[PDB]
RNA sequence: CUGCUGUGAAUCUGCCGGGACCACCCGGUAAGCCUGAAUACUUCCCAGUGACCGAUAGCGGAUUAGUACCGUGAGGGAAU
RNA sequence: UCUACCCAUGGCCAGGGUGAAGCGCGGGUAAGACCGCGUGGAGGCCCGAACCCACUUAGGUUGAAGACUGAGGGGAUGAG
RNA sequence: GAGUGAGAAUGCAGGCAUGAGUAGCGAUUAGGCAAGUGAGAACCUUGCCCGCCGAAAGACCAAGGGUUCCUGGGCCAGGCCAGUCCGCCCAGGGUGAGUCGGGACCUAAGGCGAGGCCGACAGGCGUAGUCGAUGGACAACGGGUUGAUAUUCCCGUACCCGUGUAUGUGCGUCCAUGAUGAAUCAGCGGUACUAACCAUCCAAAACCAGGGCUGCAUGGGACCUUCGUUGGUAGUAGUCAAGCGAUGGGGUGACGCAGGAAGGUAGCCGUACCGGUCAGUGGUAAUACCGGGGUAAGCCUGUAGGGAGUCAGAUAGGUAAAUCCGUCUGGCAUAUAUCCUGAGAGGUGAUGCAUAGCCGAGUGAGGCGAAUUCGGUGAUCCUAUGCUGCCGAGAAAAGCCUCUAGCGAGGACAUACACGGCCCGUACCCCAAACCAACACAGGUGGUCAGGUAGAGAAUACUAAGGCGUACGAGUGAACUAUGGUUAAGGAACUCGGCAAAAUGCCCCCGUAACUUCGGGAGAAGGGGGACCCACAUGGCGUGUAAGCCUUUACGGCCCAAGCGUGAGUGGGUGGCACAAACCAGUGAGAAGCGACUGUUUACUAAAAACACAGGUCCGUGCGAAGUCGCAAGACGAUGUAUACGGACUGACGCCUGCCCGGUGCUGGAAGGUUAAGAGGACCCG
RNA sequence: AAUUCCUUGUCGGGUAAGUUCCGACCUGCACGAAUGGCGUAACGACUUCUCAACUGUCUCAACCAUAGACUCGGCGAAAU
RNA sequence: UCUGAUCGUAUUGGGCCUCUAACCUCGGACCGUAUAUCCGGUUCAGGGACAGUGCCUGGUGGGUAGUUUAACUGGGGCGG
RNA sequence: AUCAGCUUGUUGGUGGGGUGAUGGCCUACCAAGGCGACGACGGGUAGCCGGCCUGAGAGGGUGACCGGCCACACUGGGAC
RNA sequence: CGGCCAACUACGUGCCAGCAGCCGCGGUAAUACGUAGGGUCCGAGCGUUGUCCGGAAUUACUGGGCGUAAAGAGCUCGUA
RNA sequence: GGGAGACUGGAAUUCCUGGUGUAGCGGUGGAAUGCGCAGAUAUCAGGAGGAACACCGGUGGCGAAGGCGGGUCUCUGGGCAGUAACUGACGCUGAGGAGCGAAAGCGUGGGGAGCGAACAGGAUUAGAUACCCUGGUAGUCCACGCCGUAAACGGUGGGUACUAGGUGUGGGUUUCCUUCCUUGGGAUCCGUGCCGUAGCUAACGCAUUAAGUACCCCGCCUGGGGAGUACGGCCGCAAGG
RNA sequence: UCGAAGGUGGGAUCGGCGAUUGGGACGAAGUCGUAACAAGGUAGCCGUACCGGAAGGUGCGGCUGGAUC
RNA sequence: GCCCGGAUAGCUCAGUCGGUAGAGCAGGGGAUUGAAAAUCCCCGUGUCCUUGGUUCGAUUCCGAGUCCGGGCACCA
RNA sequence: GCAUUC
């Protein structure tokens, strides 16, 4: 759920925080943690290539299993649900009967002690991962591969899910969280369920400093820059920019998907805008 | 004459040049290679010359001179 | 090697206030909501040194200083 | 034949005038006298005083500097005066490490980068690697000594890596003691070649206007075959048992922020005891006063605190194997049981070292040397990489431990003796005239120690240890300027404006409005008390010794007179103009505009109403995405996946956000009009 | 009106006196709904107006001390 | 053979559906390789004569670059 | 009730004081009580009664004179 | 002296001047206006205003109501 | 069809994809905006998605009222009859108070087919901020809160006893006639309708389901307007109650 | 010690005036529509919401205190 | 003040070529109605602001004057 | 279909 802060200070008025109710353990698996460091939005040239990044809390990477392909038939039990800094969803530590320990995105409703299984023979129960071929149409799924063996790429953020609409030949038709309908190979893997932590979107961060903790630097509006800095810059007093809205690099607001991408053959229709 | 991109021949009745192009004459024999001398220059070494300078001149530098000193640095840079 | 921003790894923030959530107990009820009393120690929270700023004013203005000094001023567990 | 004629280009170089014997001589501490030295003394030396700093202007470092350090000498440059002095000049001397700070150890960001990929060339990136501390690991403390170094030399006592010899205990390759487990022959049931048995489904050919045969398909039991069962051979021959053990596997290393409480110690304040003083004053001979009232690492011991279940069977998940780790099943556990970890107390180290004083004797060296108990207070240091809470969820590698793989005939451990322990730094300055500042410059410079009395305090006042008086002085009641001080009566009449001053200020009680997002507003406002002495008081509270009580007798527990410390209140008295006494230390109230708020900004005339902000909407983006850097490769976005990411405008919150798609963008469409190169090649011309 | 030229608009309030300020009117030169409109508790070294207290800001200036100024000795510039 | 309607044999262009073999894959596995999210090879699984990239060509193109933007004038601008 | 909470000598106790007398009447200590929708605490109005006026009565209104109580004596306080 | 409510006609103005407790009377023929004659009720008094009760069963105890006139809480549960 | 949760079914509207196929479709009192000719409407197939549940289905059932209808399953409330086994007046009502409470509306997050305030055009008209037409946003739907009103009506407060009958219908019991046919008929208990006596009512009407005859408790009225308004207060995010 | 009057302070509460501004009632023969009463020419009314010079219009749910059949 | 555009029926607006003055509303007379309004049918209404000039002829093509809308009156 | 007022 969401816990609302009391208005004891201007910075806290209106703000809220996760109740972290699903969290069972406060520390990660040592053997599944890798180091991570901040990039500040700078690339190999040391140039800022993504603005508004830097200054966030230090965090470590939990190795998430996005393939789940080498454990068909080996059941696992959910040992813990824990917080991950690197994504909106929570993560579930699985103990396989192999004695292997792996992290997976925690689906909605998955509790400690549940049994999870993988592969063609698995039951259609939240957290079970199996080829789309064996997933009946109409089911809600997440963490879907784009290419067989490529690893889960779609529907990974907290609360999101994909609906498997149907199967025809080698392809399954999927409705994306965005609403776009697209085809994927039926050999591609998916996990049954929605993604957990769906309440996170309702959090009111409350104050500038908390976004700084999350690594977001301030965004200066174009209209308050000078012409040399931004096409919207300039003018005496307040202005609307003095021209059609453009990026800081002058690109107009239009479609930016490249024409004639090969994936255009797999896309049935694009998302609808302003429905 | 020559680069890149397409297209793409004939072995002497051949082919290529004679300022679009054609004919006729003339010259030559492409898509293989090598080649001394006459020409250009002087960090450095030797022997000399000047209706050239003679210490604010002549080299930035006749004197610890690319030194002292200035500059983060590239670099600037004396005076005796 | 100034300055702007970022990355990694360390350090620093006298003293004094206020009293969030949570927890516990007692009222209250059919159970609650709710209400007292503790415990608790939250916060770009409060007052205020170090420290970081530079709001007002006087002096300096061939300065002690190519931007400073005195007197007050702001932030001071944090976007430090 | 000309580098041939200067008065001027805010011309250039050198020398030198004018201003002028003028302005200055660089803080907010301050010097004085006596004596000495010397040609010369306000400034040098010594003594006695005075003053200043004392979270520093004291003490120790990093960075930086580079001989500035010590001794002797110098005094025509330098020092804002003089100079016998100097951070200046000259000569000589001075820096000693297995343990300190680094390397020979380890990695972070980042750098470089074998091959490599990309790029006309130049080059751009980057893999394996290899560097790179601000972090990880790793062995020493106290005292003494030189003119100048000292955890480095010496003394005392330790600790950590190596090497050789000797001696003594067990452990063994070959001998042999213990230990397991596998091939194969032979006696048995369900897989199951294959011909059939049973149940069930279908119609080629099909009869007639529903009926049969045959074949096909599926499931069950059964012969061959094969797998499994249990008798022999085969513990026959194999294999394993002493240690070393990874470059490989697994643990640990291994981590945030806030917040106490508790238990300690350093330090400080007293005190038993010890040594000693009479400071020419009215009183004060021990009753008063002054000085001591010390001592590390290490090694014993294992308290407060914190942290943990253990054994057995199975396993190939851990890029091979595993007795290790992980996982799953069983049995036994809630104990002050056991073990790990760990402040401190105590013991030892220490018959030593050190010290208040006292001898003589002055160049200042040397000898002798007392007491050393008990309490109180108390850390920002230690237990603590702990514990509790929270969300923003908090390096790596080596090292260490363990596991096998693999090495193995020799090897492990203990004691004694004799030895090795490399390289670089080490002087001195280091909040400063020795670093950054052109200067012996009121600026700047990270870290470590933190005495006392007032006090909440690292504020502030005075002051101890220690360090300074810091480099022009001497005079003098001018105006005037600066910096402080006081002011009759009036009290904003000043002025653009209460600018600047003045005022308020502390602690404990009482008492506090509109409005509100119910948190606030609020220290709202307004008001009362505060000194000293005595009594209550041989009281209350903290601490806690003797005695006493309990016990799991120990580094136990309970209680506790005395002793020490310490408020708060009540009553009475006493003194002043004043009791927050000095220093220190909110002015308050009513209302409007703008911005919600804490923040950010024009280094050096603007700090704001500008920027940011949490919140909102739109647009883009389906994934080496969109966007951005790049010629590319590649990178960031993101080890993210539409509850995400980028861009645009708006800017907490409350109530709301109307009409226009003609213009110009953006999105979609393609029936018309128009339209490139490429195709075509009529006809015409030479 | 941080927007109003005319304009010190007009009326009310505050003052002995108010081109500023507060409340209104609407004749909006030339407001207006995310270059958001209208409000808003809390917050401000922002800007504006009023009051209490307080004062050398003033009526109106006087006196004291220190650093310069001034005198003597030493050193000894500068712009022009 | 011609006004013109048609069928099959060639030649040659346009569209559309497929196929695999060029080409592509930051999809999997394996090897070079002790080490290796580089790179290369092998192979499997997908795209596929499309895409990408040469050359030629028409658009969009203040994203960037070089430049232009007169004179007269009772100062210049505006007007003329 | 368009007035829901009020009270700290306030509610009770003991030892004193006080009065003609009982009693927080006063006082020191001790206990934490007392009064309230059977309207406490507030606000408004009013001297009360025998009676009078009206009315079939019940009731409504009223308190001049006469008679009984109470209260005050320019306003507020005090005692002798 | 219209009806309540005892007591009527003429003249004068004609929605004027005026009357009135209520309903209502005055618009050139008024028993309601003004005057006169007559009449009626009271009489040293008669009228008017104010005030209270009655009529008012119109706060209904005696002594009223709530389907449609004013009036059943939107519906339950339950405290005194 | 009393409530709650979960899952699920088909018809139809809309959209999408693809055939077939053209030039009209759509709409009205009559038209026009509108949708088409870039391939609509119509017709066929497939897909998506949301909302409401035809027939059964009634002046019938259940619920305190508001209300409740596709199916299935799970959890759960009330009512009625029969039997008198049990308790032994434990009852009734209820100022304040608490809870529930259509639709609209409000907050946050989803969803959005159809419908549709506002908003556009078209038409009508003197005008037409309407009625009619074409579109169309909040909303209507879901999750969790808030709001607390309706002609929330039987315009009829709750409990109890009594006072001619007749006739429908829903849920139980029982006696007879007997085929044992059974809507055969009777009696009885509990609902729900119609019609009618007595009695009541100003009348209309009510009439064993009272507005009759009586007892207990609550709420409410006191001429029409001003006004269910102002002020104060309480509640609410606001609207407002 | 207690203590009238007096002083100071921040609030309670009851009123009066107030530029400007809200609605209410009444008034003669004014202006604009025609919403209600008949099916009042779109049945009316109730709650609520949005809109419009005004009456009022429209949506959602409700009522008959609704005509014709 | 400078530069534009205006000025036509009672009102609001077209017209322009040098040979014109036309629309909607209002007004007047009929019709419809018991009577108004709405509606329907016949009618009337012009220095084309003033002013001079060109021309055979001016609403029209020039210059001037009055009145009225727009864009400007700036830099120290 | 339309049909306001006195
Ligand atoms: Mg790099
Ligand atoms: Mg951004
Ligand atoms: Mg997370
Ligand atoms: Mg968010
Ligand atoms: Mg911004
Ligand atoms: Mg700007
Ligand atoms: Mg630009
Ligand atoms: Mg502007
Ligand atoms: Mg979006
Ligand atoms: Mg040629
Ligand atoms: Mg050659
Ligand atoms: Mg010479
Ligand atoms: Mg020279
Ligand atoms: Mg430079
Ligand atoms: Mg240098
Ligand atoms: Mg703060
Ligand atoms: Mg700054
Ligand atoms: Mg000066
Ligand atoms: Mg300062
Ligand atoms: Mg201050
Ligand atoms: Mg302050
Ligand atoms: Mg502060
Ligand atoms: Mg904090
Ligand atoms: Mg010359
Ligand atoms: Mg000369
Ligand atoms: Mg000269
Ligand atoms: Mg001179
Ligand atoms: Mg002079
Ligand atoms: Mg002078
Ligand atoms: Mg001087
Ligand atoms: Mg000095
Ligand atoms: Mg002397
Ligand atoms: Mg001196
Ligand atoms: Mg001092
Ligand atoms: Mg020296
Ligand atoms: Mg020396
Ligand atoms: Mg010397
Ligand atoms: Mg000298
Ligand atoms: Mg000198
Ligand atoms: Mg690296
Ligand atoms: Mg590289
Ligand atoms: Mg290379
Ligand atoms: Mg290294
Ligand atoms: Mg280091
Ligand atoms: Mg030394
Ligand atoms: Mg970790
Ligand atoms: Mg004496
Ligand atoms: Mg010890
Ligand atoms: Mg001793
Ligand atoms: Mg040293
Ligand atoms: Mg220096
Ligand atoms: Mg200095
Ligand atoms: Mg101190
Ligand atoms: Mg200090
Ligand atoms: Mg100095
Ligand atoms: Mg001096
Ligand atoms: Mg003086
Ligand atoms: Mg004075
Ligand atoms: Mg005075
Ligand atoms: Mg003044
Ligand atoms: Mg003045
Ligand atoms: Mg003024
Ligand atoms: Mg001031
Ligand atoms: Mg002051
Ligand atoms: Mg205030
Ligand atoms: Mg006195
Ligand atoms: Mg601000
Ligand atoms: Mg603050
Ligand atoms: Mg601020
Ligand atoms: Mg500035
Ligand atoms: Mg400033
Ligand atoms: Mg945002
Ligand atoms: Mg890209
Ligand atoms: Mg936009
Ligand atoms: Mg803005
Ligand atoms: Mg387009
Ligand atoms: Mg004004
Ligand atoms: Mg005025
Ligand atoms: Mg105003
Ligand atoms: Mg604007
Ligand atoms: Mg808008
Ligand atoms: Mg806008
Ligand atoms: Mg704004
Ligand atoms: Mg400020
Ligand atoms: Mg002086
Ligand atoms: Mg002098
Ligand atoms: Mg192509
Ligand atoms: Mg340009
Ligand atoms: Mg050029
Ligand atoms: Mg010009
Ligand atoms: Mg001019
Ligand atoms: Mg011009
Ligand atoms: Mg007594
Ligand atoms: Mg009275
Ligand atoms: Mg009566
Ligand atoms: Mg009579
Ligand atoms: Mg009565
Ligand atoms: Mg009466
Ligand atoms: Mg009545
Ligand atoms: Mg009744
Ligand atoms: Mg009624
Ligand atoms: Mg009712
Ligand atoms: Mg539900
Ligand atoms: Mg179609
Ligand atoms: Mg169709
Ligand atoms: Mg009840
Ligand atoms: Mg009630
Ligand atoms: Mg609703
Ligand atoms: Mg709304
Ligand atoms: Mg809603
Ligand atoms: Mg919504
Ligand atoms: Mg409710
Ligand atoms: Mg109601
Ligand atoms: Mg109803
Ligand atoms: Mg009702
Ligand atoms: Mg009844
Ligand atoms: Mg019945
Ligand atoms: Mg009846
Ligand atoms: Mg009745
Ligand atoms: Mg009313
Ligand atoms: Mg109301
Ligand atoms: Mg009110
Ligand atoms: Mg008024
Ligand atoms: Mg009507
Ligand atoms: Mg109607
Ligand atoms: Mg109508
Ligand atoms: Mg009606
Ligand atoms: Mg409407
Ligand atoms: Mg309706
Ligand atoms: Mg200007
Ligand atoms: Mg009319």
PDB file of C-alpha atoms in Angstrom, chain A residues 182-230:
ATOM      1  CA  UNK A 182       2.436  -6.829 -31.754  1.00  0.00           C
ATOM      2  CA  UNK A 183       3.367 -10.378 -32.748  1.00  0.00           C
ATOM      3  CA  UNK A 184       6.133 -12.463 -31.152  1.00  0.00           C
ATOM      4  CA  UNK A 185       7.329 -16.002 -31.777  1.00  0.00           C
ATOM      5  CA  UNK A 186       5.376 -18.614 -29.817  1.00  0.00           C
ATOM      6  CA  UNK A 187       8.722 -20.130 -28.795  1.00  0.00           C
ATOM      7  CA  UNK A 188       9.441 -17.027 -26.698  1.00  0.00           C
ATOM      8  CA  UNK A 189       9.143 -17.386 -22.930  1.00  0.00           C
ATOM      9  CA  UNK A 190       6.788 -15.512 -20.625  1.00  0.00           C
ATOM     10  CA  UNK A 191       5.909 -15.445 -16.927  1.00  0.00           C
ATOM     11  CA  UNK A 192       2.300 -15.806 -15.783  1.00  0.00           C
ATOM     12  CA  UNK A 193       0.805 -12.884 -13.870  1.00  0.00           C
ATOM     13  CA  UNK A 194       1.051  -9.139 -13.513  1.00  0.00           C
ATOM     14  CA  UNK A 195       4.056  -7.355 -12.050  1.00  0.00           C
ATOM     15  CA  UNK A 196       3.711  -6.536  -8.361  1.00  0.00           C
ATOM     16  CA  UNK A 197       4.082  -3.248  -6.483  1.00  0.00           C
ATOM     17  CA  UNK A 198       1.356  -1.675  -8.640  1.00  0.00           C
ATOM     18  CA  UNK A 199       0.671   1.015  -6.011  1.00  0.00           C
ATOM     19  CA  UNK A 200       4.101   2.654  -6.479  1.00  0.00           C
ATOM     20  CA  UNK A 201       2.753   5.001  -9.181  1.00  0.00           C
ATOM     21  CA  UNK A 202       0.642   6.812  -6.557  1.00  0.00           C
ATOM     22  CA  UNK A 203       3.636   7.961  -4.479  1.00  0.00           C
ATOM     23  CA  UNK A 204       3.864  11.735  -4.045  1.00  0.00           C
ATOM     24  CA  UNK A 205       7.587  12.453  -3.759  1.00  0.00           C
ATOM     25  CA  UNK A 206       6.835  15.731  -1.961  1.00  0.00           C
ATOM     26  CA  UNK A 207      10.064  17.708  -2.204  1.00  0.00           C
ATOM     27  CA  UNK A 208      12.917  18.462  -4.588  1.00  0.00           C
ATOM     28  CA  UNK A 209      15.480  16.721  -2.388  1.00  0.00           C
ATOM     29  CA  UNK A 210      13.862  13.296  -2.705  1.00  0.00           C
ATOM     30  CA  UNK A 211      14.185  13.330  -6.504  1.00  0.00           C
ATOM     31  CA  UNK A 212      17.835  14.283  -6.006  1.00  0.00           C
ATOM     32  CA  UNK A 213      18.186  11.110  -3.932  1.00  0.00           C
ATOM     33  CA  UNK A 214      16.797   9.229  -6.945  1.00  0.00           C
ATOM     34  CA  UNK A 215      19.393  10.812  -9.245  1.00  0.00           C
ATOM     35  CA  UNK A 216      17.275  13.396 -11.096  1.00  0.00           C
ATOM     36  CA  UNK A 217      18.925  16.781 -11.592  1.00  0.00           C
ATOM     37  CA  UNK A 218      16.828  19.936 -12.180  1.00  0.00           C
ATOM     38  CA  UNK A 219      15.286  20.590 -15.611  1.00  0.00           C
ATOM     39  CA  UNK A 220      15.571  24.174 -16.880  1.00  0.00           C
ATOM     40  CA  UNK A 221      12.801  25.193 -19.280  1.00  0.00           C
ATOM     41  CA  UNK A 222      13.849  26.278 -22.760  1.00  0.00           C
ATOM     42  CA  UNK A 223      11.903  29.558 -22.663  1.00  0.00           C
ATOM     43  CA  UNK A 224      14.086  30.924 -19.834  1.00  0.00           C
ATOM     44  CA  UNK A 225      17.365  30.386 -21.725  1.00  0.00           C
ATOM     45  CA  UNK A 226      19.031  32.687 -24.232  1.00  0.00           C
ATOM     46  CA  UNK A 227      18.721  32.100 -28.010  1.00  0.00           C
ATOM     47  CA  UNK A 228      22.282  30.743 -28.186  1.00  0.00           C
ATOM     48  CA  UNK A 229      21.293  27.986 -25.728  1.00  0.00           C
ATOM     49  CA  UNK A 230      17.851  26.910 -26.968  1.00  0.00           C
TER      50      UNK A 230
END
